[PDB]
Motif scaffolding. Structure first.
Motif, PDB file in Angstrom:
ATOM      1  N   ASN A 238     111.908 -13.389  43.058  1.00 27.99           N
ATOM      2  CA  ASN A 238     110.656 -13.033  43.755  1.00 27.99           C
ATOM      3  C   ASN A 238     110.542 -13.746  45.089  1.00 27.99           C
TER       4      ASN A 238
ATOM      5  N   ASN B 255     102.191  -6.303  25.341  1.00 19.08           N
ATOM      6  CA  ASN B 255     101.441  -5.377  26.176  1.00 19.08           C
ATOM      7  C   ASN B 255     102.321  -4.813  27.337  1.00 19.08           C
TER       8      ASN B 255
ATOM      9  N   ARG C  54     116.765 -23.867  31.243  1.00 17.97           N
ATOM     10  CA  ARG C  54     117.433 -22.551  31.416  1.00 17.97           C
ATOM     11  C   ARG C  54     118.898 -22.735  31.829  1.00 17.97           C
TER      12      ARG C  54
ATOM     13  N   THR D 284     111.517 -11.583  35.721  1.00 21.13           N
ATOM     14  CA  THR D 284     112.777 -12.325  35.660  1.00 21.13           C
ATOM     15  C   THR D 284     112.585 -13.833  35.417  1.00 21.13           C
ATOM     16  N   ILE D 285     113.622 -14.494  34.852  1.00 18.90           N
ATOM     17  CA  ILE D 285     113.602 -15.935  34.572  1.00 18.90           C
ATOM     18  C   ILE D 285     113.826 -16.720  35.874  1.00 18.90           C
ATOM     19  N   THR D 286     112.921 -17.643  36.205  1.00 17.55           N
ATOM     20  CA  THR D 286     113.090 -18.537  37.351  1.00 17.55           C
ATOM     21  C   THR D 286     113.701 -19.754  36.639  1.00 17.55           C
TER      22      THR D 286
ATOM     23  N   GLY E 120      98.765  -9.261  30.444  1.00 18.07           N
ATOM     24  CA  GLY E 120      99.367  -7.968  30.164  1.00 18.07           C
ATOM     25  C   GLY E 120      98.686  -6.843  30.914  1.00 18.07           C
TER      26      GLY E 120
ATOM     27  N   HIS F  39     102.932 -11.350  35.384  1.00 23.39           N
ATOM     28  CA  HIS F  39     103.222 -12.136  34.185  1.00 23.39           C
ATOM     29  C   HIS F  39     104.731 -12.322  34.043  1.00 23.39           C
ATOM     30  N   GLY F  40     105.138 -13.247  33.186  1.00 21.52           N
ATOM     31  CA  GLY F  40     106.548 -13.542  32.976  1.00 21.52           C
ATOM     32  C   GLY F  40     107.278 -12.665  31.985  1.00 21.52           C
ATOM     33  N   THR F  41     108.434 -13.166  31.534  1.00 28.58           N
ATOM     34  CA  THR F  41     109.357 -12.515  30.602  1.00 28.58           C
ATOM     35  C   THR F  41     108.946 -12.495  29.124  1.00 28.58           C
ATOM     36  N   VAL F  42     107.862 -13.216  28.781  1.00 29.97           N
ATOM     37  CA  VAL F  42     107.286 -13.322  27.420  1.00 29.97           C
ATOM     38  C   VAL F  42     108.304 -13.856  26.397  1.00 29.97           C
ATOM     39  N   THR F  43     108.898 -15.024  26.732  1.00 24.07           N
ATOM     40  CA  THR F  43     109.900 -15.743  25.919  1.00 24.07           C
ATOM     41  C   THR F  43     109.508 -15.828  24.430  1.00 24.07           C
ATOM     42  N   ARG F  44     108.253 -16.246  24.153  1.00 23.88           N
ATOM     43  CA  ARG F  44     107.716 -16.405  22.804  1.00 23.88           C
ATOM     44  C   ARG F  44     107.937 -15.164  21.942  1.00 23.88           C
ATOM     45  N   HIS F  45     107.559 -13.968  22.448  1.00 20.87           N
ATOM     46  CA  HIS F  45     107.739 -12.703  21.730  1.00 20.87           C
ATOM     47  C   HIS F  45     109.210 -12.349  21.619  1.00 20.87           C
TER      48      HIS F  45
END
Ligand SMILES: NC(=O)c1ccc[n+]([C@@H]2O[C@H](COP(=O)([O-])OP(=O)(O)OC[C@H]3O[C@@H](n4cnc5c(N)ncnc54)[C@H](OP(=O)(O)O)[C@@H]3O)[C@@H](O)[C@H]2O)c1
Ligand SMILES: NC(=O)c1ccc[n+]([C@@H]2O[C@H](COP(=O)([O-])OP(=O)(O)OC[C@H]3O[C@@H](n4cnc5c(N)ncnc54)[C@H](OP(=O)(O)O)[C@@H]3O)[C@@H](O)[C@H]2O)c1
Ligand SMILES: CC(C)(C#N)c1ccc2c(c1)N(C(=O)c1ccc([C@](C)(O)C(F)(F)F)cc1)Cc1cccnc1N2
Ligand SMILES: CC(C)(C#N)c1ccc2c(c1)N(C(=O)c1ccc([C@](C)(O)C(F)(F)F)cc1)Cc1cccnc1N2
Lengths: 390, 391
Positions: free
Chosen positions: B94, B305, B80, B73-75, B266, B286-292
């Motif tokens: 979390n 991954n 944001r 999830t986005i903190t 991943g 790991h995070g939300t993978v914003t880039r992808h």
């Protein structure tokens, strides 16, 4: 005639490192450099016999002579006490020396083109310097633990609640940092970036420990702007503060070649104690006595011990001695010995540990490496050639 | 028929992780397991709309149901808050969850034989469990003291932290309650029993004699009293090691141990283990993978991954199976884990993994699979595995 190297403080150590160190002096230093050598025997048996007095004298000699080269030493534990029938469990010589000198420890790796790195991009070394006590106690039961500041002028009293123990019982501590030691860390770091000619970066976690880490950010910047910005810009170098996460990210994509000030194989890393005055330096390999290899040596087995980190303790020490005395011949020697060490490995001549880094330990065969003496002999041969070609 | 999996608390997340979470449910979980699903949408927009009530309820449900499976999830931060036009800079889900349940976060790596680790000798994973500070600047000369005022009215205790004479500096105060150390010991012993691996506690009790000594004493007292027997019964032990002697040991080891630390992404899972030994919450480390996600938003090909996220489900499902003595679900959770490792080991992997092997500048399109192709491969291999297991 030999190069006149001047005044150097040398410390002998223990086990495998004691053997390689003598080989370094015999094969690589002494045939070319004459030194006004201040030798101290920091071997375990000698520290015990002298009631650790030799360690203190060595530290005082580095204070006086400004240049110290140290061989690895046994730090005693219960097993070492039984092994050498020690009078006491002597403190680490490194700690004693650090406590007497002070300063910042910088760890720099020795880069070889044919030797793999954690990040393939790293072509130039990354120099990492860590900061250089606490009132801890047991909270027997419920009640409030507060930390209070009262200025000498007595015009204020700030009280912060650490914690109100309710189910009660625990532990608490108070820790501080004076401005001088933050400044000393900045001076050592700025003087380190000038000597190596690479940019300096300060990393912090001032998102969490805001005020504590924020002081490090501010003191570094003030010192830079007030006595360093000129010489940095006039050498294409710079100082830049980066947060922990933005730092680890940029370094992973980098080619290396930078000083990394931190506020928080193996035979290929050096450790250098840089005193804030920029005058005193203590160099040593960033590894132990290599006990395992010493035991093989005592059993008559062939050893393949990497002497690179130990050679670089000598070259860094001699390079600093040359810088202090404006000694071009010694400056040329220290660098030539560093080049010969890298070139020999790059030419395919190396010890077992390095062959294991390339091929992988189970795929290493006797022909892939050189033994301790064969490797030292090849370095000595290559140094004679490089120096004769004056 | 599908397996009756029982009661599972599921939390939906954000960005690339939300997309993959749906694919795991659809392709890997739902075609084989029926669940009494307690689903909470922890997407940023939903947390905003419900004024973060969804997060408090999700944690409340994990307390009641014992098994939590969470999506990244986005903190939120200032960027944001502007991006979604948030009413508040909402606190990390979390953080809200951990505070409600208590417990210790354990980070475990998923190991594949063809994927490089720090120490190549590390064949078995190393599970690291980690265990609140008042800092201020000292403008000039003066005294910094730390006091303990007993609640029973008895004499106040004063310790000098430092008397700044030359003046100027910085100071801080830290604490730790005995209940927290007790919970840390319990979750650690519970984690070591569950995996059947030895447990190590690393501390700096030579320097922090009173502070880190309380940790060393509490762990031994708990070990000797309620865990020595169970550990010996499994040919396992618990040992205190000073930090430096602990890292030297770990680096010279083959892995396969739990490490209680008092100080590719991943392929890392994060598991919150409550002291009771009954409540467990799993997620990817790991995070939300914003880039992808931005690439996916622009209709561009992605290679994310899903391993860490799949293992969040598998650890949760293995814990559910353990609590309910559900052999079929326990077998399914292990099979999903093995099929994930075995798929990568056979040469079918995402970009980040291919980059671990070949290096980022040398990675070609033919060396990896996109997000969907990889999920399809795992799905195909899962169907084969479970058919073969019927014997
Ligand atoms: N600065 C110091 O004076 C210092 C620092 C640390 C430890 N020590 C002392 O040294 C003693 C033993 O240390 P240790 O065995 O823990 O650590 P170590 O000497 O760093 O060596 C541990 C292992 O790392 C490898 N290694 C390290 N340096 C190497 C080299 N130059 N060439 C080839 N391989 C090398 C060897 O691994 P393989 O066996 O796999 O080849 C060796 O067995 C202790 O009594 C300790 O107190 C001193
Ligand atoms: N536990 C949690 O819920 C948690 C933890 C940390 C962050 N976050 C949140 O996630 C958001 C953004 O995260 P972030 O982009 O900083 O961190 P992240 O998602 O962990 O990933 C950062 C970068 O590492 C690579 N990566 C991470 N996981 C990967 C995977 N499974 N497969 C392939 N590549 C992977 C990607 O770079 P490449 O483009 O190089 O592949 C990615 O852009 C934030 O708003 C933050 O609040 C949540
Ligand atoms: C022992 C140590 C950590 C210190 N002091 C240290 C100091 C200097 C260098 C290394 C290690 N080398 C690394 O492989 C390495 C490992 C981890 C990290 C970090 C900080 O952990 C990061 F990963 F976070 F960046 C950074 C660098 C070898 C190396 C290789 C090539 C060029 N230069 C270097 N220099
Ligand atoms: C994220 C983290 C650090 C936590 N919590 C963590 C937890 C567990 C594992 C790792 C990392 N992995 C490491 O490569 C690693 C890195 C650093 C260190 C140490 C302690 O910092 C050391 F360097 F001191 F050893 C120890 C282990 C991956 C890995 C790979 C193979 C088998 N098991 C594991 N387990």
């Amino acid at each position: 005639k030999k190069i006149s190297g001047g005044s150097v403080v040398e410390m002998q150590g223990d086990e495998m490192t004691r053997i390689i160190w003598e080989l370094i002096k015999e094969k690589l230093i002494f045939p070319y450099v004459e030194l006004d050598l201040h030798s101290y025997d920091l071997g375990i048996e000698n520290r015990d016999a002298t009631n650790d007095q030799v360690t203190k004298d060595a530290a005082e000699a580095i204070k006086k002579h400004n240049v110290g080269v140290k061989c690895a030493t046994i730090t005693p534990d219960e097993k070492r006490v039984e092994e050498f029938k020690l009078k006491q469990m002597w403190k680490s010589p490194n700690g004693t020396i650090r406590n007497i000198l002070g300063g910042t420890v910088f760890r720099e790796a020795i880069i070889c083109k044919n030797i793999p790195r954690l990040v393939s991009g790293w072509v130039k070394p990354i120099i990492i310097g860590h900061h250089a006590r606490a009132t801890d106690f047991v909270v027997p039961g419920p009640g409030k633990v507060e930390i209070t500041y009262t200025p000498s002028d007595g015009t204020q009293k700030v009280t912060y609640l650490v914690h109100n123990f309710e189910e009660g019982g625990g532990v608490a501590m108070g820790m501080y940092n004076q401005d001088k030691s933050i400044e000393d860390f900045a001076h050592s770091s700025f003087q380190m970036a000038l000597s190596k000619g690479w940019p300096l970066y300060l990393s912090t976690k001032n998102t969490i420990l805001k005020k504590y880490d924020g002081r490090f950010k501010d003191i570094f910047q003030e010192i830079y702007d007030k006595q360093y910005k000129s010489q940095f810009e006039a050498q294409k170098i710079w100082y830049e503060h980066r947060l922990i996460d933005d730092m680890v990210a940029q370094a992973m994509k980098s080619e290396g070649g930078f000083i990394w000030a931190c506020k928080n194989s193996l035979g290929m890393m050096t450790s250098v104690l840089v005193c804030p005055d920029g005058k005193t330096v203590e160099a040593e390999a960033a590894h132990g006595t290599v006990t395992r290899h010493y035991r093989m040596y005592q059993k008559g087995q062939e050893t393949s011990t990497n002497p690179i980190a130990s050679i670089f303790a000598w070259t860094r020490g001699l390079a600093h001695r040359a810088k202090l005395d404006n000694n071009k011949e010694l400056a040329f020697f220290a660098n030539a010995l560093e080049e010969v060490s890298i070139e020999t490995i790059e030419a395919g001549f190396m010890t077992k540990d390095l062959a294991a880094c390339i091929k992988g330990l189970p795929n290493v065969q006797r022909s892939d490496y050189l033994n301790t003496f064969e490797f030292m002999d090849k370095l000595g041969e290559n140094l004679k050639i490089k120096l004769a070609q004056a």
